[PDB]
Every structure is written in structure tokens, then in C-alpha cells.
Amino acid sequence: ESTPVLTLQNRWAYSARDEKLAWDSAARDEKLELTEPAGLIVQFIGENSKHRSVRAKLPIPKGNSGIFYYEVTISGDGDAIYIGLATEQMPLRDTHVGYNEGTYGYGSSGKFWGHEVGGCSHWGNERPYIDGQPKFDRNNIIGCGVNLKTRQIIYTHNGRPLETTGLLVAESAAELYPCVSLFTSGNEIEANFGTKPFKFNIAEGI
Amino acid sequence: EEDDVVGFDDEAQTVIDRLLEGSGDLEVIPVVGMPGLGKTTLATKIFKHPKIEYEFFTRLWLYVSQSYKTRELYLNIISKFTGNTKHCRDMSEKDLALKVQEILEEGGKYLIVLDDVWSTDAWDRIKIAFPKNDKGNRVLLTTRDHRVARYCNRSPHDLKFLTDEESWILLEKRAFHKAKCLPELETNGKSIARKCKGLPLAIVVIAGALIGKSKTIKEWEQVDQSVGEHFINRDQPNSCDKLVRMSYDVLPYDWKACFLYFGTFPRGYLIPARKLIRLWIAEGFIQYRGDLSPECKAEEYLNELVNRNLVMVMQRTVDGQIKTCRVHDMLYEFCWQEATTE
Ligand SMILES: Nc1ncnc2c1ncn2[C@@H]1O[C@H](COP(=O)(O)OP(=O)(O)O)[C@@H](O)[C@H]1O
């Protein structure tokens, strides 16, 4: 459980089906720009601000061994952002990770989403959230991951691990993919899947 | 204002997709969700959508109140298409229905909006007017009963809530009428928006209260504090009365009476504004104080109750004045309950 299971060659990517339905809608103004061939930097280039999500190419490892983990550095305004793990079915518009069902997320507003634990707050579809978590803005380095053995979700803020005791990811047959949801124009992020050193020391943390 | 519609774009898209998909047979599309979740709002968004105007040229909107009768529905349809209900005023319900069926068989690919469908009984009765002329016809349905939806379609559309962020943007846009929120109120305002949990109606109501409250930090936090986290109770969301009361208590006494007067009409009733003006004058709520003539003072009160959002604008005239108005069925609960106490 303490050995990291890296998806080093993982990158932000819309799938063939995501692009199919994304170009089924004739609106271009609703897209994020990807800094290829790296595809680790994403920029919200829309005029009007709305929830827009992008997912990684590869899903999480499905083993009972080691840790899945990635980090995201925030540039731009850094506000109205949600980082976490989404299903492939998750809409990339008008929803954020964690808000969407079967997904779990950490919001810039300071909320963990999708974690039904005793004493949590219920939102819209009585969607379980846990409020009062650290907010994040520009220049912060946020980690999201899952201990594959205990199934406990892992969040880190600028390399500091956060309270996630009892926050489990469901062991479904469906694959979960790294996902980030931006809102405001000018928001920029850069993803770290292990290509650069993590600020959270996995070796000295798990 | 179409400008004020927030975050329902992919919702509209996914609904338009299901409208465009399907066979030539008549296909019925139910949108479901609790009162105030914005079903009627989304229905209007899709109805006015360019690509829906493109596919379905024959378009019509019908508000099927819980208190609606089938004879009236057929007569409403006939009046819309032909403008001559003379001969149909004494026609039997079947003769009316067959007459509509004729218009629809001659009419092309058509889209019918039925707003606030209350029962499957009503649906099955209404359906008699629609031919299965296999022209790819569609019927858009809004309802508050999940059973009603699932009877029409096994896979109905559950209308989403708003995100914290979407909640804030709607609140700001309604509370400040296109102007931006002052930074000092931002934290309290966002807290307030959050406690709405992403319910459009709750957000719009409280905007009306805040408009009426001074734009001071202390007044907004009073509000934020008084709005407990779980005020919208799943047992009675119809008991958002406390959210309404907060907006209500801010109203001058003159407007309180006018507002509660809505309790004197039937639930969900489509009220012609000019008719209401004259009646408000009759009941003596419009005090001729100063220069203001009673008609101008009545329309000001009306415009103001619309500014407070508590009354919903249903139609505008060519003048840009209010043609017909409605108070939401959840607001009627308050008007009915409070007006039996006062
Ligand atoms: N996407 C939206 N953006 C802004 N306001 C909205 C939105 N959806 C709904 N509303 C507001 O919600 C209020 C109540 O919605 P309504 O359609 O009457 O509820 P329902 O039909 O679900 O009973 C309306 O006054 C409308 O302005």
C-alpha cells in the first residue's frame, strides 16, 4: 500500500466519444485549450464562465497494492476549481468532479464531495459534501489520490496531507480517471503524474 | 430576461438530443424535479432554442394547472391555430378533440409543451387530441411527480441543482440587476448562496429580500445567520415559508396586502395584470398619496413586486409592460397560509 503506482505517461485528453459529442454540439466557445504535446497544461479560454471538465487518458490502477496519486499546480485566477476522480460517463459541461454522481472531488471553495460520512452536509440531490476544508488559489500545489489497498482517498495541499480518514472510493467495475473542473476564464493548471517530483513525499507519508 | 438563465445549457442540450432522437411515432419527454427547481424555466429555454425552432416549426405552449379541465385545453388549442372558437363553444369534448386532431394531422412536425402536468389521467385524457400521424412529433412535459414522468417515459430527465458557484452567479445577477456585487458582501453572499443548496427558486426569492435590504455588511450577515443550513427541508420544501417570510417582512405594509391578495385567486392562476391593477385599486391597497394617480401607483407596486421577484412575469405587452403574471405554487402556499393568519 506504501509503494506508489505511477501513471507517468498519463495526460489530459478528451476521448474519441467525448470529442464525438463535443463536436456534436456546434459550439466552439465552450472548450479548454490543451498545451500539446505535453497535454499537462490546460487553460480555460471561454468568454463566459461555466463549469468545464477535462479527464486524463489512463484510468487509476485497479490493484489492491500501492498508491495512485497525481498533483496539480494552479495558475491564473485559481478560483472555482474542482480536482478529483471522475467516471468516463461524467459530463464535461455544467458540472464539476465530486458534484457528479459516482465521482469524488476537492473544490477550491474548500469542500470534499462524494463522501457520504456521518455528519456530512447534503446539497442538491442531497449530494454528500464535507465543508470547511482548505481553500486553494493561485500558486498552490494540490494532490489527489487513492490508497488502493485501504481504498481511502488522499488529498494534499502544497505537500501537506489532509484529513481523509473514512473517505473511501467505491470498488466498482467502472474505471475512474483523474479529472479537473475549471470555471472562470483565465484559469490555468499544470498536472503532475510523476514526470516532475511530487511535493507530497509519498515515501515519507504512506 | 433570458440573460438571467444560469448553468442549464448542457441540460438543454441533453433534452434537445432526446427530442431529436426517436422514431416517427409520437414521443413524450418528461422533465421531473421538486417545485422551484426550474422545470418551467428550462422548458422555456428549450422552446426558444434555434435548433428546436428549426426541427419543429409547429410549436405551442400550454400550462396544465392542477386545476385544469380537458374541454378548455382543446378550446385553447383551436383558438391558437384558427382564431375562431365560435362554432366550438357548443361542440362536445370529442368534436373538439377530433377538430384538434384534424389541425394536427394537417399541421406538420409539431412540438407541444405541457407545463405542470399533474396526473397520468390528465395526460391520457389530453392525448386524445394528438394524432399518431407518424410525422416525428414530440411532446415536452414538466411535472413534480416522478410517477407521472415514469409513466410517460421509463427514463425521465431529472433536473439538476446548481453548483455553489452557479448559485452565487444567479444570486448576484438577480440581487444586483446586472451590476456586480460589492466585495464586502461577497463572503456573506456566497455563504447565503451556498445554503440555498442550488435551488433556483430559493436563490431568486432571497435576491428579492436582499434588494429590499440595505447593502450593508451587518444586514447581510443577519440574513446569512438567520438562514440556517437546512432551512429547505426535504419534508416540506413547501416550507420555504421562512425564506419567503424574510423577503416578505422587508416589504412595506401597502405591498404586503397586494402580495397576499394573490391568495384570493386559485393556485397557479394566470392573472391579466391590467385586471389586477383595477382590483387592487378596488380593495383600497393603493393609497392615493401625493401626486401619484392610483393606476400609476398600482403599476409601480406591481413592477416593484416583480423587482422583488416574488411575482413572476408570464407575458409582456408590446409596450414592454406586464401583460400577464403568476406567483409560483410554493409562493401561493405562503400567501394562502399567511393570509389566513392576517
Ligand atoms: N437556470 C436558471 N437560471 C436562473 N434562474 C433560474 C434558472 N432555472 C430556474 N430559475 C428561476 O427559478 C424560478 C422558479 O422556477 P420554476 O420554473 O417556476 O420552477 P418549477 O417549474 O421547477 O416549479 C423562476 O423564477 C426562474 O427565474
Residue numbers in the entry:
A (entry chain B): 18 to 223
B (entry chain A): 153 to 494
Original paper wording:
The nucleotide binding and leucine-rich repeat (NLR) class of intracellular immune receptors is an important component of innate immunity in plants and animals. NB-ARC domains consist of a nucleotide binding domain (NB), a helical domain (HD1), and a winged helix domain (WHD).
To further define the interface between SS15 and NRC proteins, we attempted to crystallize SS15 in complex with the NB-ARC domain of several NRC proteins. By binding and immobilizing a critical hinge loop in the HD1 region of the NB-ARC, SS15 restricts movement of the NB domain relative to the HD1 and WHD domains, preventing immune receptor activation. Combining information from the cocrystal structure and the alignments allowed us to select 13 candidate residues to test by mutagenesis in NRC2. We conclude that the E316 and D317 residues are critical for SS15-mediated inhibition of NRC2 and that mutating these residues to their equivalent amino acid in NRC4 allows Rx/CP-activated NRC2 to evade SS15 association and inhibition. Mutational studies of this interface allowed us to generate A amino acid variant of NRC2 (NRC2D317K) that evades SS15 inhibition without compromising receptor signaling capacity.
